[PDB]
Amino acid sequence: KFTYRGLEIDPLLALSEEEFKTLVHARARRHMNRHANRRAPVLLKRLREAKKDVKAGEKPRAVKTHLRDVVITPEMVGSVVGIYNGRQFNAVEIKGEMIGHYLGEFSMTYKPVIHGRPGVGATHSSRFIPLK
RNA sequence: UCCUUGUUUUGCGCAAGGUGAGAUUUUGGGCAACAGCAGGUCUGUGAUGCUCCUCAAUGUUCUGGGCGACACGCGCACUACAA
């Protein structure tokens, strides 16, 4: 199951570029129009390569990229993509509900913070907090 | 300036009134001595002493990605919006 707009997988695939960018949100539309002229020259190819070659019963071989300014189309669904937070290629597989998004959104770029006791200088009043 | 010849010592001026566009540093600025601080700035400059680094660089990198005064229990400064 998954409904993007009340469309299963096969309808989405069937859509040509025109019919596609009509259906998607405002950002995605704006993106595609402004771009033209490739602008994901390698990031299409590398996926569709390793995608095809699979014997199924398991995911494609992972591909790595730094880029995250590229959309998620119904073409690239099922693949295993790397996305780069500035020190780690991060593992994501592409679901049918990741259509209408970007890549970068699934790849965290910071550790969430959880604190560890405040030291001196926090509290204005002075006690010279032992021991942390 | 003028007058009150008030006040003041005849002096330096002062108070009230008059004249007038304007009445007392007319109103508001800019400039500003002598002696200093071991204040700040080597992130302004082909302003720099001595040191550090130099081809797998601390250089150049307008290269790809992240981070920056932004990441979140909490204290403080200034701002804005309200009851």
In a domain, A37, yes or no: yes
In a domain, A121, yes or no: no
The CA distance from A76 to A99, in Å, is 9
**Which residue's C-alpha is at the least distance from the C1' of B76?**
A124
Closest-approach nucleotide to residue A68, Cα vs C1': B65
CA angle A49/A51/A52 to nearest 5° reads 75
Domain count, chain A: 1
Determination technique for this PDB entry?
Answer: cryo-EM
**Strand B footprint nucleotides (protein C-beta < 7 Å):** 64-68, 71-76
Domain holding A11, by residue range, is 1-114
The CA distance from A98 to A72, in Å, is 7
In a domain, A130, yes or no: no
In a domain, A80, yes or no: yes
In a domain, A120, yes or no: no
In a domain, A124, yes or no: no
Q: State both tokens at A44.
A: 């299409």
Sign of CA dihedral A48, A32, A69, A106: negative
CA A89 to C1' B57, whole Å: 28
Contact A95, A77 (CB under 8 A): yes
Contact A27, A121 (CB under 8 A): no
In a domain, A129, yes or no: no
Cβ neighbours for A21, distance < 8 A, ≥ 6 positions apart: A28, A29, A32, A33
In a domain, A78, yes or no: yes
Cβ neighbours for A44, distance < 8 A, ≥ 6 positions apart: A75, A76
